[PDB]
Amino acid sequence: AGGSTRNGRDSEAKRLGVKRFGGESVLAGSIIVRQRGTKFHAGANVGCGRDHTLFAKADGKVKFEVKGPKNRKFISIEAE
Amino acid sequence: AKLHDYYKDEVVKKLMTEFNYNSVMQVPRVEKITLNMGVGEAIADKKLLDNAAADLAAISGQKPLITKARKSVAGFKIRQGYPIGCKVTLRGERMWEFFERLITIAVPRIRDFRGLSAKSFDGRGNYSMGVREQIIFPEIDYDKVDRVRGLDITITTTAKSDEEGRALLAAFDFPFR
Amino acid sequence: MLQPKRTKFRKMHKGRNRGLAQGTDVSFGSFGLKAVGRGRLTARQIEAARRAMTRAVKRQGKIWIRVFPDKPITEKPLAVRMGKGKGNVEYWVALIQPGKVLYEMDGVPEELAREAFKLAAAKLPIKTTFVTKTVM
Amino acid sequence: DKKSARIRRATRARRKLQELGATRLVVHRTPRHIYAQVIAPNGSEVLVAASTVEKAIAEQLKYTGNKDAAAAVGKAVAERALEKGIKDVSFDRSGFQYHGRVQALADAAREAGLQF
Amino acid sequence: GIREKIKLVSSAGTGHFYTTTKNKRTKPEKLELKKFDPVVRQHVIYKEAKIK
Amino acid sequence: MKKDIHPKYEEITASCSCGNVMKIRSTVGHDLNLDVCSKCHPFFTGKQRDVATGGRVDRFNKRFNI
RNA sequence: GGUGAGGUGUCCGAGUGGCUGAAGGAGCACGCCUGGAAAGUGUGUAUACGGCAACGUAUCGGGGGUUCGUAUCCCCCCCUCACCGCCA
RNA sequence: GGCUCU
RNA sequence: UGCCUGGCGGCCGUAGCGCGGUGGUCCCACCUGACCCCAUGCCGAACUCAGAAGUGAAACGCCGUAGCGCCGAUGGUAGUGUGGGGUCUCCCCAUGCGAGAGUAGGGAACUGCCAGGCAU
RNA sequence: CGUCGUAGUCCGGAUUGGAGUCUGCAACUCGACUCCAUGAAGUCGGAAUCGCUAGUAAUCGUGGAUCAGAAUGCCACGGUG
RNA sequence: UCCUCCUAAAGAGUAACGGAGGAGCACGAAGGUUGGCUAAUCCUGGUCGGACAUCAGGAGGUUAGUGCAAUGGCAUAAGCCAGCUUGACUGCGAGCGUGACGGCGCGAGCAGGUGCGAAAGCAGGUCAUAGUGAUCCGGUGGUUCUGAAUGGAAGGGCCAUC
RNA sequence: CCGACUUACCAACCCGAUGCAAACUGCGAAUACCGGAGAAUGUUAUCACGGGAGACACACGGCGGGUGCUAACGUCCGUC
Ligand SMILES: [Mg+2]
Ligand SMILES: [Mg+2]
Ligand SMILES: [Mg+2]
Ligand SMILES: [Mg+2]
Ligand SMILES: [Mg+2]
Ligand SMILES: [Mg+2]
Ligand SMILES: [Mg+2]
Ligand SMILES: [Mg+2]
Ligand SMILES: [Mg+2]
Ligand SMILES: [Mg+2]
Ligand SMILES: [Mg+2]
Ligand SMILES: [Mg+2]
Ligand SMILES: [Mg+2]
Ligand SMILES: [Mg+2]
Ligand SMILES: [Mg+2]
Ligand SMILES: [Mg+2]
Ligand SMILES: [Mg+2]
Ligand SMILES: [Mg+2]
Ligand SMILES: [Mg+2]
Ligand SMILES: [Mg+2]
Ligand SMILES: [Mg+2]
Ligand SMILES: [Mg+2]
Ligand SMILES: [Mg+2]
Ligand SMILES: [Mg+2]
Ligand SMILES: [Mg+2]
Ligand SMILES: [Mg+2]
Ligand SMILES: [Mg+2]
Ligand SMILES: [Mg+2]
Ligand SMILES: [Mg+2]
Ligand SMILES: [Mg+2]
Ligand SMILES: [Mg+2]
Ligand SMILES: [Mg+2]
Ligand SMILES: [Mg+2]
Ligand SMILES: [Mg+2]
Ligand SMILES: [Mg+2]
Ligand SMILES: [Zn+2]
């Protein structure tokens, strides 16, 4: 008999990711992306939350797009 | 601006000749003079720093900017933010008037003056020298002080090379050697 | 015995050894010992085959070793139940795919390199072959 | 250098008005002249424009790069904007200080009828 | 947990209070902030008092 | 420049032993009497004299005659 | 096998991040008394350093490390001290 | 007061 | 309509670097001065103001240039969904998808709105 | 009589550089002295320890022997006391 | 118990006495806003000054920084200076996310009143993700809501809070 | 003190070539998943509410893996 360990810990899964995909009609206030950083960025009719959460300010379809000189990823809401 | 007039009338014609510049804007010119006093011993007391800035304010009629540590080192017993030195930037007429009082008064008041070095031009025309003792300036009273400070002078000019600044200072009769 | 000086981590997963190799052609030297089989070698097997070809060439020529054992291998001790943490790092291996050039050699004739690499392959668990520098 | 730091100094408010959808007044300042232009919310085309480089404005002036020229420019661009029916804009200082010729321009445009 | 807790009493005569924390070692001077008082519907100076 | 923080910077006269009268702006206030100026400094004659190696053979031949 | 504590100049002994290259003491060297010694009494004291030898290198068990910085903090190696190594 | 050996 | 320049964009390296060359009527830039607006934890350096003597030196713009950066096929290879098989730590067959890297090669951006200048 | 006026000083004179004199065949190792400059330590000395009872101690100069030259040593002499 | 990465099989989620690290706070400014700024390291020269303080130029281009672990972000800076300040507001909240549930989270916008800014606007704590404990019982302030014949009161309720 | 040289004795940076990575990524699939449109098929196979449960000891096999010795009719996950 003998031994021990030191690597037993881990945290809970925060359920991040993309909640609504492209071409997918949403309501105002609908969470599109939950994320840690700004892996994506807020485009037209899309707000950025306190935790870099991307929510829809209006109603319509989700548009993923890459803009800017740095090729950053923007999310926009088309009208509907 | 006496030397500024002497530059504009005789030095520019001199250097345009001795370098064969196409344009007159291609000529060197002096831009600023920086007067540092690194006081690493003021962590003992502020008054050593506080009185050295008072001495350097008499030399150049500006209030000096008291500098601090960029980072923390333990070999010098300093933390990032301690006031550790003082600087003065001199431009314009006060630059020229200090450079006049320098090469006319203070350099002869150097103990055992025998010339400067022409190997102090930092590869890109900008000249830097260091004096051992502030009493060579007549601004400082000999009786009023107790402690021999020291400072260093850094002449930042627009000369690209090292020789264009060497000819520029030689045009100002700068005592190299 | 070859071994990494520093490591970012002390232990590693067992992984797999599937796929083809990349170090196929004789890059540096003239003759090569190419692995045909699949498996994992060790620092002992590498250093023993290096000694066997250094002695077989009488320090004539130049010998490259293309592989390096960087994977730590754990074992649990005797009379230890299967739980209670991962075992201790015991030795170091290099994963070998088919096609990997293991050793290279020049400055010697071909027949001497053949008998040297044969004495080396007799120290290796995997099946090898002899290759030469191909133009293109 | 100075041009680039001016652009960095301006490129936050330009993107902010870009997402606000704001019809935007762009000021540009030189030592000799001062420029103004009203830009559509797409940011790719203009509506009205005024400057001290125009003859109709410069011939009425002493120096093109003083405060009186800047007020004459903000007056001309405001009277042209209200002529074209553009009334509410948002002022882009374009990386300059809201001071001096820029402030005198915006005070002229406020006085002439624009709303910012 | 050296950062103790206090309350910010309205100076408008009402007993309304905000609750908050402070480091009493490093900030010995009293905290005074101008906060909204929902009873009077005005911004009123609140002052530090004891949490009791 | 700022208004109050700087010391007084006033034009005074500095005269020298060679009679080099020079008016400079300074923080001294009163007039200045010098000892050596750049005009009268022995940089152009004295520093030429001040090497003074001297000969060992010349001292030897100087001290006597054969 | 595992647990807990720990490794300091000749020795003992302080010291658990900021003159602690280290107290203090004993010891060692020098001196002084003694006919000589001891015991005394006073005075000093780590190791390689070299720039001229001023003061940085270094070393708290060895190796690694981080914090601006470690004798103290942490990590591996060991070495040693106390406990457990039971039931069948 | 106490103070060893040679 | 042509040329040049400035401003605001689109696009985000085939668009960037480098190297050489080139521009001053206008524009721009540097530049002159600062009692003033305003400013410097000192400094008219910057910011700002009042200006226009000078210069295109720098910067910027333009032209050229394959030292790079970048882009980049075709074919093959790796992988893999399903079904099947073997000598089953790993592979193969039918079928479908099909990279990355590399090669040939491309390549010294294109374009919109407004204003001004010189020509027409 | 004047001077310094409590300081490492107009104290102290070491050390060192340069220029010299003399003795002596000959002053490098290895002499004494002079001149100019240089201006250390040292601000009355731990434990411990020495001498001295009157012209004594203390202090001040002088001479001689030895010796070409070469003493702060030695042996003598007087002064103040 | 909680956080971060891998394992985790390119949506989410996913276990082991699997591999590695952290948390049980801090801040009345280290928050808000307005204005401005842009590193690390190295090279050369330079009084004391030295490997290493401070100063000037150049290379470099974020290899730095983020109050703390890691990951993801960060130049429009979320990083760094200064001015003014208290939005570290109260009542609400369309609509979604996430959990068996208790619960947790994001949130434009509305009403009042406020701060900065010329203004557009921004602000309902901090770059985000750890910094925590249900109910009961009891305490404190406020509030006529209730008040065992009635008027009060005790006590209770509601709000805030320990 | 200055160094004299030479000797390569090692070697930084940089350059070229070559490998390796679950906690590396200037690239990047197949599948899977989410959403939309459209046929054919399927005894609504879907969702909501309500009545009643049982069950929460799984096993092997294929594939992708952790651990173990790519040992176990071993163990722990995903999927069938
Ligand atoms: Mg028993
Ligand atoms: Mg005995
Ligand atoms: Mg006896
Ligand atoms: Mg200017
Ligand atoms: Mg040019
Ligand atoms: Mg292909
Ligand atoms: Mg490809
Ligand atoms: Mg190109
Ligand atoms: Mg080009
Ligand atoms: Mg006298
Ligand atoms: Mg003397
Ligand atoms: Mg002394
Ligand atoms: Mg004394
Ligand atoms: Mg004699
Ligand atoms: Mg006598
Ligand atoms: Mg996943
Ligand atoms: Mg998956
Ligand atoms: Mg912060
Ligand atoms: Mg800002
Ligand atoms: Mg340096
Ligand atoms: Mg944070
Ligand atoms: Mg209970
Ligand atoms: Mg009642
Ligand atoms: Mg009652
Ligand atoms: Mg991977
Ligand atoms: Mg049912
Ligand atoms: Mg159960
Ligand atoms: Mg179960
Ligand atoms: Mg199961
Ligand atoms: Mg399996
Ligand atoms: Mg098994
Ligand atoms: Mg099983
Ligand atoms: Mg298994
Ligand atoms: Mg199970
Ligand atoms: Mg299975
Ligand atoms: Zn003179």
UniProtKB/Swiss-Prot annotation, chain C:
PTM per Swiss-Prot/TrEMBL: Is hydroxylated on Arg-81 by RoxA. The modification is nearly suppressed when E.coli is grown in anoxia.
InterPro entries: Ribosomal_uL16, Ribosomal_uL16_bact-type, Ribosomal_uL16_CS, Ribosomal_uL16_dom, Ribosomal_uL16_sf
Stored Pfam families: Ribosomal_L16 (PF00252)
CDD domains attached to this UniProt entry: Ribosomal_L16_L10e (cd01433)
Gene Ontology CC, one term: cytoplasm
GO molecular function: rRNA binding; structural constituent of ribosome; tRNA binding
Gene Ontology process terms (BP): cytoplasmic translation; ribosomal large subunit assembly
Modification (3R)-3-hydroxyarginine occurs at: R81
Keywords tagged on the record: Hydroxylation, Methylation, Ribonucleoprotein, Ribosomal protein, RNA-binding, rRNA-binding, tRNA-binding
Positions where N-methylmethionine occurs in the chain: M1
Family according to the record: Belongs to the universal ribosomal protein uL16 family.
Assembly and oligomerization: Part of the 50S ribosomal subunit. Cross-links to the A and P site tRNAs. Interacts with assembly factor DarP(YjgA).
HAMAP family: Ribosomal_uL16
Function description: Binds directly to 23S ribosomal RNA and is located at the A site of the peptidyltransferase center. It contacts the A and P site tRNAs. One of the last ribosomal proteins to be assembled in the 50S subunit. The simultaneous presence of uL16 and bL36 probably triggers ObgE's GTPase activity and eventual dissociation from the mature 50S ribosmal subunit. It has an essential role in subunit assembly.
Protein name: Large ribosomal subunit protein uL16
Native source organism of the sequence: Escherichia coli (strain K12)
